[PDB]
Design a protein around this ligand. Structure first.
Ligand SMILES: [Mg+2]
Ligand SMILES: [Mg+2]
Ligand SMILES: [Mg+2]
Ligand SMILES: [Mg+2]
Ligand SMILES: [Mg+2]
Ligand SMILES: [Mg+2]
Ligand SMILES: [Mg+2]
Ligand SMILES: [Mg+2]
Ligand SMILES: [Mg+2]
Ligand SMILES: [Mg+2]
Ligand SMILES: [Mg+2]
Ligand SMILES: [Mg+2]
Ligand SMILES: [Mg+2]
Ligand SMILES: [Mg+2]
Ligand SMILES: [Mg+2]
Ligand SMILES: [Mg+2]
Ligand SMILES: [Mg+2]
Ligand SMILES: [Mg+2]
Ligand SMILES: [Mg+2]
Lengths: 88, 129
RNA sequence: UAGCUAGUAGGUGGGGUAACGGCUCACCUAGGCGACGAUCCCUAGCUGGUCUGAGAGGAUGACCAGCCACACUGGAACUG
RNA sequence: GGCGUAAAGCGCACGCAGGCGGUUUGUUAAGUCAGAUGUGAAAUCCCCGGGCUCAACCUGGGAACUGCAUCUGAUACUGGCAAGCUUGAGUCUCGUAGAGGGGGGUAGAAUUCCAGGUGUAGCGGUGAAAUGCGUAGAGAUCUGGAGGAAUACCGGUGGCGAAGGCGGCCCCCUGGACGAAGACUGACGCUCAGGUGCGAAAGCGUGGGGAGCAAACAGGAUUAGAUACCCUGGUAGUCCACGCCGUAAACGAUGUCGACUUGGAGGUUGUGCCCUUGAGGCGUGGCUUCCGGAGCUAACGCGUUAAGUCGACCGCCUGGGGA
RNA sequence: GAGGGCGCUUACCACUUUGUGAUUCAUGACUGGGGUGAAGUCGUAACAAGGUAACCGUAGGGGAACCUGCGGUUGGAUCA
RNA sequence: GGGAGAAGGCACGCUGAUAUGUAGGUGAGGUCCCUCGCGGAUGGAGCUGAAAUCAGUCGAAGAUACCAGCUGGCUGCAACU
């Protein structure tokens, strides 16, 4: 799925230090990265319905963190969608 | 999920009595702690403990008499999906006054007889016989 | 029957009204209702209560008493 | 009240609205509960009475009108706010098994057809037959060749998937699943009308493909008949692409999630400890099969993978025919 | 002279009219299925292994029940 | 896509005002920038100017002439140009 270096890089970039491996922002970047990577995969193949059901799980899970994030703290949510360029 | 911990307490009791278990244990909670107390005072269980600190474990020591379990029936009434409140003049009595109903009042959870003597109503948690 | 909606819903002012209000008029705003059933269609006068029912309901609203409504059909003022 | 078989769980999923919600302190007092004041026409109903000889009847005072509105209070519960909490949930690390998906490549068996050799009169088929094929040399056999489909053995109440479903081998991209320690977010969870996607086979559009099988079609038989079962042939279609269709006994005829309740023998896949002292041994986790205990059930049965014992949400049922 | 009233004149509107819709009740040659009987004709599909296991979905055929193809389920008998 | 100009209706001249000609459109002098010309913001003078609405006026008649669709329904055949 995702390589250890690209996850370790994101864990550094978005968490309170290197070990904040479960923060909300961390989770959503990790989800975003694989979602955008798979954009390439599913442009091709595309009949790979089984893999996509796995993808929709990643998306819907990403919204739940964002909605959870949006409430409990608002500046971090806003900062975050800007930083990843989603939402119109 | 565990959206009703009250049925869980009741049910662990109901099934353990049915299974001749000597005792039963479950995650604690203050509201649970108030129920084990009423049960002991009305002679339905021996004793209880809330051993644990961070992840408090509640313990009820069950009671048996003749080959029978002291608890004949114990069922949840009000419930997250359909809450039941009564005043004072509408307070149910269980088994025609035999047994008890556990009620939550403005001055806390007690049996109907006690709440009656104090002229109050509340959310009726269960019936016990 | 799933969308209904231009005096439509809000505004400023003129009138009007025993009295407030789109009551009405010009003038701005583009809103308002509705899935918590809007509109549409079918039906019906409403209640106290009545019959049944352990009860909860179900049915129902002659006689009695309370409110609305009509007065050969439709439209209109007039007087007080 | 119900939905394994009587009528009834949507074929499966994700998911907005919606309904539901773990645990500690604090606050708030909306829902709640207690007190009151106003109100709830009277008649009626009821209670205790009076009254006409009784009684219908009439009536007196009280009950009750359980509702509402406000007001002063209660804080256990539910809720709204704040601060948290790690045991639900999710992330990270190392790993294990698998017909999970999508694409590309390739391999060896087989059947069909074309070319060729040898060889002689039958092959073939059936209950028996005949159609058919064969002296223009079939069939049988050897050789070379073309092409499509499917992947023997392993192969297993074996494995994976949310169902549909997915099996030769290699790679590429890719989803889920489980175990071990440990760290991290800190209620982010459950469920879903609508909606959205998936969805066997057959069918359909367009263009490719076509060996084998085979609706239709045709022949030969069987038969009282024989629009069939059998036989000789055979078109769609089965195959690929892309797009529809949206259905099946889509079944466990059992919706999803979480908690609790005696046991026995296996299969499968993790992992700790053990002298692997040698196939073994004991533990702890995941999935699964069979039998069963209580209980449940109308019975049949189900029986820790419930049809037991509770809990939140959904779907759906209301005599048969007609339909 | 005010002012009134009058009559006319504008607005609004009922009775009524023209074109066009939508909805309902009744009816209609002919026509599709559906139901019921008197126990007719034809057959004999299902029930037993129902004499070709049965059914679901689907597609084609066929006087009819039905036969046949593909997949699925057991709610199929017989399994030394 | 259509059918559709379906079908069927209200409008129509003239005049004053709102505004002695409004919106617009065209765009002078002034001015200032000019890397200075066939150059440029500022500028709104003058020119030109449709409809619209309030109110009047007229004949029998205001799309007044020329000019310029008849429209609707059942059906045969052929796709269509
Ligand atoms: Mg993987
Ligand atoms: Mg005003
Ligand atoms: Mg009426
Ligand atoms: Mg009854
Ligand atoms: Mg009238
Ligand atoms: Mg029933
Ligand atoms: Mg059935
Ligand atoms: Mg199901
Ligand atoms: Mg009264
Ligand atoms: Mg008397
Ligand atoms: Mg609270
Ligand atoms: Mg095709
Ligand atoms: Mg055949
Ligand atoms: Mg169905
Ligand atoms: Mg069993
Ligand atoms: Mg038969
Ligand atoms: Mg048969
Ligand atoms: Mg078959
Ligand atoms: Mg022609």
């Amino acid at each position: 799925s995702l390589s250890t270096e690209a996850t370790a890089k994101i864990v550094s970039e978005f968490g309170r230090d290197a070990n904040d491996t479960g923060s909300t922002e961390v989770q959503v970047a990790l989800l975003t990265a694989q979602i955008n990577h798979l954009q390439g995969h599913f442009a091709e193949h595309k009949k790979d319905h089984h893999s996509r059901r796995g993808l929709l799980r990643m998306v819907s899970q990403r919204r739940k963190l964002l909605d959870y994030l949006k409430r409990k703290d608002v500046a971090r949510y806003t900062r975050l969608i800007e930083r990843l360029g989603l939402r119109r | 999920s565990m959206q009703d911990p009250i049925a869980d307490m009741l049910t662990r009791i109901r099934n353990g009595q049915a299974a001749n278990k000597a005792a039963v244990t479950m995650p604690s909670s203050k509201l649970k702690v108030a129920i084990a107390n009423v049960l002991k005072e009305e002679g339905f269980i021996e004793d209880f403990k809330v051993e644990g600190d961070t992840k408090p474990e509640l313990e009820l020591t069950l009671k048996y008499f003749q080959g029978k379990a002291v608890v004949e029936s114990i069922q949840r009434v009000s419930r997250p999906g359909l809450r039941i409140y009564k005043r004072k003049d509408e307070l149910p009595k269980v088994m025609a006054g035999l047994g008890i109903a556990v009620v939550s009042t403005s001055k806390g959870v007690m049996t109907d007889r006690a709440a009656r003597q104090a002229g109050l109503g509340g959310e009726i948690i269960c019936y016990v016989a």
